[PDB]
Symmetry: C2
Subunit: 199 residues, 2 copies
């Protein structure tokens, strides 16, 4: 399909979730606010949970592109990690990421289909990308870990940090871009220390 078409349905869905929740917004309303037939909307997004999850997928890929996770021969590992950490910190703390995570929280154990879709679209894609990268870094002998997937998870938990928790529950302490950057550098240095090769 035309990029305009997919972007239009995703942006219309996004715009509608940031006013009404999963419950409030409806696929007929998405079709009407996107300027496309209900048929084209079912034609690409079988059900609402699929649509929500796929918009998540798009935002993630935008802020953390697949290129970021290539460790070319001779590439500087520090710069790669730093870019992934920066992209991730922007992603999770963006207004749209926060809104959609609070909608997802509003129906955790009351909506298992949305829970499993949401997880597979956002967190799972990022952890897979990162496990691939960390496996390449293990091969090159730059880092050392028994399980690279667990290391990817530690990396993202460290980057996310308590700041994001506070910003999510409504105690939005005014956060500098300066403070955010000191955080991401400190975390990448901590990760490199903790996973150094050579002992």
């Amino acid at each position: 399909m035309d990029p305009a078409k997919r972007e239009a349905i995703l942006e219309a869905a996004k715009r509608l979730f940031l006013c009404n929740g999963y419950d409030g917004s409806s696929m007929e309303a998405i079709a009407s606010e996107a300027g496309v037939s209900k048929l084209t909307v079912y034609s690409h997004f079988t059900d609402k949970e699929t649509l929500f999850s796929e918009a998540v997928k798009a935002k993630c890929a935008e802020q953390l592109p697949a290129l970021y996770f290539q460790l070319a021969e001779g590439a500087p590992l520090e710069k790669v990690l730093l870019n992934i950490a920066r992209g991730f910190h922007r992603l999770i703390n963006s207004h749209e990421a926060i809104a959609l995570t609070r909608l997802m929280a509003a129906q955790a154990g009351q909506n298992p289909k949305l829970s499993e879709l949401f997880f597979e679209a956002g967190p799972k894609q990022v952890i897979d990308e990162m496990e691939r990268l960390l496996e390449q870094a293990r091969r090159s002998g730059k880092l050392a870990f028994p399980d690279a997937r667990h290391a990817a998870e530690h990396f993202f938990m460290l980057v996310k940090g308590c700041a994001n928790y506070r910003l999510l529950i409504g105690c939005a302490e005014p956060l500098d871009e300066a403070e955010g950057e000191r955080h991401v550098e400190e975390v990448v240095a901590l990760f490199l220390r903790a996973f150094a090769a050579g002992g």
Copy 2:
């Protein structure tokens, strides 16, 4: 205060704060449920805000006794950190904790005053304790960090890892106690690697 009275009042307050909502629970309902007088409740908890605060403080202190945050001279640091990590893991993965964290996130726009009560009662007190202990660990010269409070937040993010996130969004079950133990042991080992004094 008399322990049977405090126990009845907390059990009632928790059950009501769950079965109905925080806004659907009243001091009068808590009183009547606990088998005590309105005056008893107001004598030991000024208002519903304070009762909620005290419930949260209470669960934290049960799973994380202040005794944990004291580093006896020459005492092994790894058992100390393991105890802290095991208690925090239990604290945050309980059904009460998962339910409340979901709620705080799902009602950030509606009532962030509640979210600030929550933050000040639980997360901030646990970080305060952990900062104090990590300062004692710096002074024994076993661990090194520029900012023990940032190190405490790193500790806790690593401890509530990806599994806790999956449980919050409604897409996994809690880990059994042996799995959680494997996780915490990995995390404490990493943290000791990452903050080893002498590099």
